[PDB]
Structure 1
Amino acid sequence: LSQVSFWLNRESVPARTVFGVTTVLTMTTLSISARNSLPKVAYATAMDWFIAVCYAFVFSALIEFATVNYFTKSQPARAAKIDRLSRIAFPLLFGIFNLVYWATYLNR
């Protein structure tokens, strides 16, 4: 849901911002909700690494819409280039992250 925002119109500022702020609020309430299951251990589990990486991805898609909106009206070419790039970069890095994660935690 945070990655769909890239494909939204570049002029629709109000929509992409709601996307970012929500996807972050949701990830926070879900990082406290899922955390509400385990006892109070002093180390980081595997689910907590997955949640941290997802939270990172979300905040990168946000930081990326913010960068595009700060570069638009000045260099729209640079904005178009970074948007057309992120639209591919993000999915492949999240796919390889899922592959690595499940491979390293299902073999033990």
Structure 2
Amino acid sequence: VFGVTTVLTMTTLSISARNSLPKVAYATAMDWFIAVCYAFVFSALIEFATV
């Protein structure tokens, strides 16, 4: 439940945060931060799967 909820939250957050800015075709800095956080969350889910 921890893993799936954290991934769902990260997805909703990545969708909401992008809504503010105009539809530009490059990746901002906040997008890089969100991507790294999504990486960490998914890696923790995969570490639980391995355990």
Q: State the TM-score, normalized to the length of structure 1.
A: 0.47
CA apart distance, 1:29: 0.2
Distance 1:23 1:55 in 2: 9
Corresponding position of 2:37: 54
Paired residues, number: 51
The alignment's C-alpha RMSD in Å is 0.3
Q: Runs of 4 or more off by more than 3 Å in structure 1?
A: none
CA apart distance, 1:49: 0.1
1:5-59 Cα offsets, whole Å, 9 max, x none, are xxxxxxxxxxxxx000000000000000001110000000000000000000000
Gapped regions of structure 2 (runs ≥ 5): none
Distance 2:39 2:11 in 1: 11
Q: State the TM-score, normalized to the length of structure 2.
A: 0.99
Higher relative contact order (CA 8 A, sep 6+): 2
Is structure 2 residue 6 aligned with structure 1 residue 23?
yes
Gapped regions of structure 1 (runs ≥ 5): 1-17, 69-108
CA apart distance, 1:65: 0.1
1:42 match: secondary structure? coil
Percent identity at matched positions?
100
